[PDB]
Amino acid sequence: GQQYSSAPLRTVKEVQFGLFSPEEVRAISVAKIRFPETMDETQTRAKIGGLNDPRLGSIDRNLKCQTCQEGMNECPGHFGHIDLAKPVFHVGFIAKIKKVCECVCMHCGKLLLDEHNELMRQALAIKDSKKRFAAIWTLCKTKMVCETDVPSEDDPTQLVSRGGCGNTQPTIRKDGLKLVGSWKKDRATGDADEPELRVLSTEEILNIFKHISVKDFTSLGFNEVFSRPEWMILTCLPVPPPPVRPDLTFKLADILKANISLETLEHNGAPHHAIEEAESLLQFHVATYMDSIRA
Amino acid sequence: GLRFGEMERDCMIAHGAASFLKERLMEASDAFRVHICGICGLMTVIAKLNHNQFECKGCDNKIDIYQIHIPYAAKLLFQELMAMNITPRLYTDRSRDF
Amino acid sequence: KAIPKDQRATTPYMTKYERARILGTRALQISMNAPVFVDLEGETDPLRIAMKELAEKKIPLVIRRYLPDGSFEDWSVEELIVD
Amino acid sequence: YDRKVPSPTGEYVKEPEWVLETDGVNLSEVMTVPGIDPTRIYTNSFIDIMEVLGIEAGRAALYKEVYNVIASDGSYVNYRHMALLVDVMTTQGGLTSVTFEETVEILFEAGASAELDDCRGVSENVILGQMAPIGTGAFDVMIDEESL
Amino acid sequence: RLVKALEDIMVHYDNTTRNSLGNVIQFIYGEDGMDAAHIEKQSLDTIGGSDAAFEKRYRVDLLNTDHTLDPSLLESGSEILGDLKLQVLLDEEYKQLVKDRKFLREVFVDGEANWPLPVNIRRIIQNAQQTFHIDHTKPSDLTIKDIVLGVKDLQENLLVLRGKNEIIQNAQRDAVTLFCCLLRSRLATRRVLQEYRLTKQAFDWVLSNIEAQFLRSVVHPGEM
Amino acid sequence: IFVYQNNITPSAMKLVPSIPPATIETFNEAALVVNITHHELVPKHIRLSSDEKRELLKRYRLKESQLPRIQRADPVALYLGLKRGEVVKIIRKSETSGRYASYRICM
Numbered sequence: 002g003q004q005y006s007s008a009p010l011r012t013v014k015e016v017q018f019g020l021f022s023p024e025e026v027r028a029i030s031v032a033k034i035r036f037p038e039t040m041d042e043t044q045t046r047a048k049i050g051g052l053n054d055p056r057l058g059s060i061d062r063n064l065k066c067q068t069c070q071e072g073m074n075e076c077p078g079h080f081g082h083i084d085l086a087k088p089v090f091h092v093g094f095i096a097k098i099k100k101v102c103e104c105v106c107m108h109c110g111k112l113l114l115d116e117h118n119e120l121m122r123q124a125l126a127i128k129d130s131k132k133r134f135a136a137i138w139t140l141c142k143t144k145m146v147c148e149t150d151v152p153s154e155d156d157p158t159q160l161v162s163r164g165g166c167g168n169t170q171p172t173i174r175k176d177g178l179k180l181v182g183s184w185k186k187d188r189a190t191g192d193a194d195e196p197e198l199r200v201l202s203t204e205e206i207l208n209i210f211k212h213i214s215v216k217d218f219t220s221l222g223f224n225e226v227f228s229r230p231e232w233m234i235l236t237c238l239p240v241p242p243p244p245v246r247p248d249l250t251f252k253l254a255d256i257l258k259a260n261i262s263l264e265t266l267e268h269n270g271a272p273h274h275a276i277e278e279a280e281s282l283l284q285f286h287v288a289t290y291m292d293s294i295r296a
Numbered sequence: 297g298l299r300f301g302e303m304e305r306d307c308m309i310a311h312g313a314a315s316f317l318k319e320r321l322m323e324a325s326d327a328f329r330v331h332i333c334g335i336c337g338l339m340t341v342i343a344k345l346n347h348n349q350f351e352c353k354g355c356d357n358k359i360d361i362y363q364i365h366i367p368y369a370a371k372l373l374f375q376e377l378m379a380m381n382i383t384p385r386l387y388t389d390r391s392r393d394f
Numbered sequence: 395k396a397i398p399k400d401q402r403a404t405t406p407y408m409t410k411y412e413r414a415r416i417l418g419t420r421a422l423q424i425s426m427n428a429p430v431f432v433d434l435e436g437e438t439d440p441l442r443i444a445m446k447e448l449a450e451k452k453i454p455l456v457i458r459r460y461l462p463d464g465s466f467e468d469w470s471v472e473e474l475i476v477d
Numbered sequence: 478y479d480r481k482v483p484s485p486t487g488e489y490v491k492e493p494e495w496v497l498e499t500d501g502v503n504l505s506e507v508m509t510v511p512g513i514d515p516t517r518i519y520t521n522s523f524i525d526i527m528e529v530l531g532i533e534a535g536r537a538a539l540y541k542e543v544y545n546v547i548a549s550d551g552s553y554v555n556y557r558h559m560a561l562l563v564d565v566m567t568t569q570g571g572l573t574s575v576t577f578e579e580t581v582e583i584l585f586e587a588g589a590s591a592e593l594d595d596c597r598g599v600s601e602n603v604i605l606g607q608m609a610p611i612g613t614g615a616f617d618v619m620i621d622e623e624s625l
Numbered sequence: 626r627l628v629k630a631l632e633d634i635m636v637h638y639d640n641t642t643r644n645s646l647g648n649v650i651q652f653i654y655g656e657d658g659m660d661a662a663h664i665e666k667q668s669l670d671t672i673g674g675s676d677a678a679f680e681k682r683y684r685v686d687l688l689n690t691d692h693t694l695d696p697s698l699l700e701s702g703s704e705i706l707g708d709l710k711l712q713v714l715l716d717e718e719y720k721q722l723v724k725d726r727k728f729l730r731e732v733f734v735d736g737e738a739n740w741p742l743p744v745n746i747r748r749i750i751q752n753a754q755q756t757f758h759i760d761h762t763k764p765s766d767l768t769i770k771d772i773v774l775g776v777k778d779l780q781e782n783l784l785v786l787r788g789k790n791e792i793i794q795n796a797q798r799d800a801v802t803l804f805c806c807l808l809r810s811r812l813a814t815r816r817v818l819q820e821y822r823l824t825k826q827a828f829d830w831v832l833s834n835i836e837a838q839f840l841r842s843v844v845h846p847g848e849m
Numbered sequence: 850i851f852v853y854q855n856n857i858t859p860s861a862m863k864l865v866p867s868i869p870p871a872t873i874e875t876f877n878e879a880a881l882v883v884n885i886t887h888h889e890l891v892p893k894h895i896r897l898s899s900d901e902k903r904e905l906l907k908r909y910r911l912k913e914s915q916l917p918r919i920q921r922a923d924p925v926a927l928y929l930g931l932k933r934g935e936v937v938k939i940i941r942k943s944e945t946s947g948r949y950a951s952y953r954i955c956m
């Protein structure tokens with residue numbers, strides 16, 4: 002690395018954290034990772050355009066990537082990707098996912114409390130974005146309805162509209178990697194006892210998240226540019242280069258085996274329940290992958 | 297004892313000895329060098345050094361780019377974080393767009 | 395984002411930390427056979443040489459002082475008063 | 478108690494005064510009792526001082542509790558160290574108390590919050606192979622091309 | 626835990642003390658911009674004493690044959706008796722001593738006179754006395770104006786903050802208030818002549834030292 | 850401002866923020882029987898005009914969030930009727946400089 006670079010040289014003065022949207026991950030990929038294999042074109046123990054060299058790294062001595070060249074040694078590592086048949090949760094954020102879910106209307110995407118309410122105005126006011134989430138969550142996890150119409154501050158004979166919808170809200174529990182929904186009408190009177198339990202597809206949750214207003218997800222601590230709430234659900238998954246791997250490949254193998262067969266079923270037409278079960282092995286292997294990269 | 301723990305660092309901070317504190321607390325883990333987009337702080341930059349071509353595929357940029365030196369452990373720690381869908385973006389400038 | 399030579403509002407006195415860092419950056423260079431700007435009226439010790447340098451005001455370096463808001467002033471070694 | 482007060486001719490003299498001292502505290506209400514001097518009432522509960530008289534009066538109580546502790550042992554520390562501490566405790570406007578791979582938990586949060594690390598700490602700077610902008614690192618040094 | 630709480634606070638080249646966020650903790654370090662190593666217990670003279678006593682020691686009345694400066698204190702002494710326009714300066718210096726004493730007795734409700742401040746003035750004066758071999762037995766060649774205006778001008782150069790605007794000027798003046806009270810109390814006309822017996826040259830040395838020492842007590846940016 | 854003898858009702862008190870811009874302040878009487886800004890530990894707080902504020906921030910070059918804070922319901926802030934975003938200059942006696950000014954911005 003004793004070779005020369007015309008790029009001016011500097012120290013790092015700032016680290017800006019966030020999440021990688023699926024767009025930016027596709028965006029700075031080289032390779033689309035689809036086959037899950039090393040070497041042997043049919044049976045040629047050499048190099049495959051599908052995982053391992055498809056333009057990222059190289060053991061080989063070869064001063065070669067994709068006209069990036071340098072030694073098996075002064076090469077960063079380049080970044081791969083793997084488009085996911087279905088969205089899965091990021092394991093790391095199940096519990097965040099769960100509490101946004103609890104803040105927002107699971108039809109419309111709109112926060113359950115707002116300016117009108119007043120205990121919420123004081124949580125809204127808090128400065129520290131992790132105390133603020135905490136606080137707004139405490140106010141909202143209680144709220145069983147997406148209200149239409151709500152007393153104002155002002156002369157409370159009268160009510161005032163808010164952007165509405167009206168739908169009842171699940172009580173949400175955690176059940177591995179599965180979030181589970183439970184709806185009522187009431188707390189056990191006449192009208193409706195027995196809740197209807199029903200799993201939360203990643204698919205609907207991603208879909209509710211993409212509908213949450215900039216104002217409303219900022220309000221929860223998220224940021225329009227660097228971390229939106231959707232991005233806690235993976236869609237597109239980065240493949241690290243061989244500098245990262247010292248048997249994490251043996252695991253991304255398995256993700257692909259699962260991605261390949263959820264797609265071959267979704268292709269074939271295939272029962273409701275098989276599609277779901279292959280979706281759940283996807284998830285588990287994408288989860289295990291990262292809860293393993295804590296190492 | 298025979299070490300240099302939290303409290304010994306604190307005394308050196310008190311005296312203002314930053315160089316010492318960097319020397320003592322380094323890795324011998326060599327300073328690896330790395331190019332970095334100045335718009336998306338990431339280590340995505342394709343550096344053709346021989347043809348003198350530097351591109352962020354995705355940032356669509358071959359102007360704004362930097363070189364930095366960091367410990368290898370850190371270049372790994374960061375690519376580990378990217379593997380987990382976390383962007384640790386390194387910027388060269390403090391006060392921004394404003 | 396830079397602050398014109400006039401209008402500079404920070405101390406005209408060198409601080410202990412600047413002085414320490416100057417002398418030591420310069421001794422590092424003198425210790426690696428870098429040309430020297432002053433008469434060695436005997437000295438062999440690079441720190442010592444550097445201090446002779448700083449006293450005769452022959453250290454061509456500039457201190458860039460950042461203010462908390464990103465902005466900065468540049469003060470030359472020549473100009474900083476050493477007390 | 479004795480109270481040093483200026484005399485009619487200008488010099489300080491002792492002038493005793495009775496003082497009451499209580500077990501327990503009701504500041505808002507005792508202040509209001511006829512016959513006392515409400516301008517000089519005190520408590521060692523700096524929380525109550527801040528609740529009744531505000532953040533600044535609490536800051537100045539808190540200092541005076543800190544200083545009592547350190548002088549009651551008989552030692553002496555310069556003002557400005559205790560002043561620093563007590564400012565750190567009151568600058569948000571209330572009284573805030575001062576009391577391979579782990580940690581992941583925290584970086585995930587960073588991610589999702591878009592945490593901006595200023596890079597001024599000594600650890601962060603170690604990880605990056607750099608000096609911390611403290612003391613001898615709180616400026617840069619550059620080559621003086623402008624000189625003869 | 627205290628060290629973990631306070632560890633990032635640093636002084637900056639604006640003299641402000643701030644955290645790693647840039648928040649302001651203090652607009653100037655220690656409320657005075659000094660380094661605590663350069664601060665010493667000194668007595669602030671104006672504060673104590675009876676009203677009679679403060680007026681013997683500091684009042685100069687050039688229009689009054691009992692309360693002028695004896696002519697053995699000063700060469701000009703004959704020539705300033707009854708001079709009206711020196712008296713105007715001296716009334717001005719006294720009014721400031723008087724305010725000084727009131728101000729301080731509000732700050733120190735107790736009357737405590739001994740408080741840490743930078744630049745041990747007594748020991749500079751003691752040095753000047755040694756260094757210029759000063760005869761207690763000869764009138765001085767200082768003038769009224771040399772003293773009175775020399776001590777006003779020194780105040781302007783005891784600098785902690787250097788900004789051209791009004792706000793920073795007010796800060797600078799507030800920062801340097803208490804030290805200026807001790808200063809005007811120590812280099813008032815009648816003390817300079819009658820107690821210290823300074824010559825012009827020693828006096829001019831006293832000042833230019835006060836000023837270098839003051840400037841060397843200021844805290845340095847970058848201190849943790 | 851409205852001073853009352855022992856309470857308001859949960860829903861009286863709801864009638865307060867109610868007619869913007871015009872604001873409405875409530876005090877219990879007992880909290881007024883004594884002037885807390887006359888107490889010795891309470892220094893002089895002086896609300897800055899929004900110009901004063903502009904100037905303060907330009908000359909320190911700060912963001913609002915870098916200034917020390919005083920809450921909306923701090924006693925003195927109630928006493929002065931401050932509003933969020935308003936800055937008080939606090940001028941205190943000081944055993945090291947005699948006088949010192951600090952500032953806090955209402956939350």
Ligand SMILES: [Zn+2]
Pocket residue numbers: 057058065066069070071076077078079
């Ligand atoms: Zn490469």
Ligand SMILES: [Zn+2]
Pocket residue numbers: 106107108109110111147165166167168
């Ligand atoms: Zn809804």
Ligand SMILES: [Zn+2]
Pocket residue numbers: 333334335336338340352354355356357
């Ligand atoms: Zn880029």
